[PDB]
């Protein structure tokens, strides 16, 4: 017996992306699954109102304020598909912990750390994982960037490249920080890699995960931005990535190491940079996208794990951890 | 007084009884009308008069209302989570309060989860240049790899009140200590034991500009500062200020405020240090320190000119000034 509750939408800027991910999950999940939608105002939509909001691909306003009058006892596993702030950062996970329900994905600590680009880089750099030079900037404080431009300026909690700017001159740093501070109280300034190759590898499992084949994203835009990520045809995924044999194994080893160190459960898509033959871990995404242009399902599809089997194992991993 | 505070104490962690002792200390001095909500050891909540009854018993094995409780959250301006350990101090209750939209006392989700994990907090501190004791993380069902020699200190990675902590003298005793630590967490840490060692503690108060209390020192006769020594009245010697030369005390306060900002803590924290052979080591950071009659945090700020009711009042104000800042 297995009935899954899928939660999508959310208040983060990735609201629309989350509903697209729900479309992909509902299409392939092998269990009976009900949808609950968190509207952009924080109020919940249940039942047919959730499926109606899914068809509209956007839910500006909801019905039930948090916590929702949801019949939690009717479900055996909860699948949070809320990308970004207040969904991927441990907040919703904390609610599901007190609720006692098994849930898909990383716990509170792993979700919060992987969503903070500054904190995650601190842990990974200390563990010996190569990362791009970076600094954190708090809103209202003067930035101090001890390396030469170009820069990449990001909200610390961002997803889908929202609020990210490529900064070529010092005079454009203030405008990029102001854009980033619209989405977070803390920003990161990273040294831009130019040129750069972008590699991605999926991980499946609890703490000790298994790695998918390594995929490489190619595009013609200035960088892998929001339009390039979710417009069909803009991004190509080369799988397996054209890498020298030792490099593919190194990417997979670094991903599983970061996965274990951070204590991630369920799943993660680990992104990498390849510049001048050197590897850098970009970030970990504990709730990767499942949109028609998303890469996580395609990484494991090339690894022999079909889309329904991938979702089956995610739900299965949630119960395995719940039973210790 | 129109301000109304909701105090949450108890919890499912092994520090359940310690949390109830902290609740009695906070309720005794808080200058606002405060209601108590008790999380029983089975996870269900006790409200109203039943919560005060469990407070007198100093233990609540069984509760009445399953989570989420039928609590009138709109009646309270600030929520004070006084839950030590897992499912209270590690960001879980903070995430629930974030979704409720209520201002709450203490660190946010990320800082609470990071500071409760003794392995991940040490990584961030070591990356920032803060001195820490050499250690290694050991996960459940995985053979230990310790690149240093005993004596060891084996702890659950998310423990409080010295629960599940063992002092290991011989390498043959390591498996028994890890088996004890794995009763409370899937991850454990193996730290190099410092002997002899002096234990220094300092409280921090604030959101953006944290201010440090005077440095205090804990002395005892037990093999280590364990659960019985921490909460049995008179068993621990609490020295405030610490009998150190002023230079070392200033270095302790500087490291505490540095770690407070590095780990992104908000509201309050008690920073524990080790002093061995003239070298300072940051032990851990506690975002919800005890308010037990034998606890250091309220005493540290009392010696700093911040009385017990004034300390609690500033905690509530800091919760409001952060929420307004968004
Ligand atoms: N240091 C850097 N050097 C070069 N390019 C970068 C750098 N940082 C970011 N980029 C570009 O910006 C894009 C987005 O960066 P990042 O992966 O941090 O954003 P994100 O919002 O977390 O993405 P996702 O949608 O995968 O969550 C990257 O795919 C890359 O193309
Ligand atoms: N590396 C070490 N060297 C010497 N003594 C240690 C070491 N680690 C722990 N101890 C002893 O064990 C006690 C508890 O350690 P620790 O502070 O990690 O436990 P805790 O559960 O976090 O305590 P708290 O109640 O402050 O949360 C310390 O007060 C100290 O006396
Ligand atoms: Mg990301
Ligand atoms: Mg990315
Ligand atoms: Mg502690
Ligand atoms: Mg301590
Ligand atoms: Rb992330
Ligand atoms: Rb840095
Ligand atoms: Rb702690
Ligand atoms: Rb280490």
Swiss-Prot record, chain B:
GO terms for molecular function: ATP binding; D-alanine-D-alanine ligase activity; metal ion binding. Mg(2+) 2 binds at residues 284, 286. One of its GO terms (biological process) is cell wall organization. It catalyses: 2 D-alanine + ATP = D-alanyl-D-alanine + ADP + phosphate + H(+). It is found in: Cytoplasm. Pathway: Cell wall biogenesis; peptidoglycan biosynthesis. Its cofactor is Mg(2+); Mn(2+). Binds 2 magnesium or manganese ions per subunit. GO terms for cellular component: cytosol. PROSITE patterns: ATP_GRASP, DALA_DALA_LIGASE_1, DALA_DALA_LIGASE_2. SUPFAM superfamilies: Glutathione synthetase ATP-binding domain-like, PreATP-grasp domain. Its main location: cytoplasm. Keywords: ATP-binding, Cell shape, Cell wall biogenesis/degradation, Cytoplasm, Ligase, Magnesium, Manganese, Metal-binding, Nucleotide-binding, Peptidoglycan synthesis. Its EC number is 6.3.2.4. Mg(2+) 1 binds at residues 272, 284. Belongs to the D-alanine--D-alanine ligase family. Cell wall formation. This is D-alanine--D-alanine ligase.
């Amino acid at each position: 017996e297995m009935r899954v509750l899928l939660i999508a939408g959310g208040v983060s800027p990735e609201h629309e992306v989350s509903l697209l991910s729900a479309e992909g999950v509902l299409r392939h999940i092998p269990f009976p699954t009900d949808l609950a939608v968190i509207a952009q105002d924080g109020r919940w939509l249940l039942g047919e109102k959730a499926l109606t909001a899914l068809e509209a691909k956007a839910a500006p306003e909801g019905e039930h304020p948090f916590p929702p009058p949801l019949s939690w006892e009717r479900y055996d596993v909860v699948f949070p598909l809320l990308h970004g702030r207040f969904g991927e950062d441990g907040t919703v996970q904390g609610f599901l912990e007190l609720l006692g329900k098994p849930y898909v994905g990383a716990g509170v600590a792993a979700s919060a750390l992987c969503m903070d680009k500054d904190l995650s880089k601190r842990v990974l750099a200390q563990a010996g994982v190569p990362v791009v030079p970076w600094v954190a900037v708090r809103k209202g404080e003067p930035p101090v960037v001890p390396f030469d431009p170009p820069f990449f300026v990001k909200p610390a909690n961002t997803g889908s490249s929202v609020g990210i700017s490529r900064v070529e001159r010092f005079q454009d740093l203030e405008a990029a920080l102001a854009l980033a501070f619209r989405y977070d109280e803390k920003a990161v300034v990273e040294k831009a890699l130019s040129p750069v190759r972008e590699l991605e590898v999926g991980v499946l499992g609890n703490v000790f995960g298994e790695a998918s084949p390594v995929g490489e994203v190619r595009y013609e835009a200035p960088f892998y931005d929001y339009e390039t990520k979710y417009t069909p045809g803009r991004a190509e995924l080369l799988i397996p990535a054209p890498l020298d044999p030792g490099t593919q194994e190194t990417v997979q080893e670094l991903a599983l190491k970061a996965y274990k160190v951070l204590g991630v459960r369920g799943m993660a898509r680990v992104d990498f940079f390849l510049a001048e033959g050197e590897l850098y871990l970009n970030e970990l995404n504990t709730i990767p996208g499942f949109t028609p242009t998303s890469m996580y399902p395609r990484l494991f599809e090339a690894g022999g794990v079909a889309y329904p089997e991938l979702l089956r194992r995610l739900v299965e991993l949630a119960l395995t951890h719940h039973h210790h």
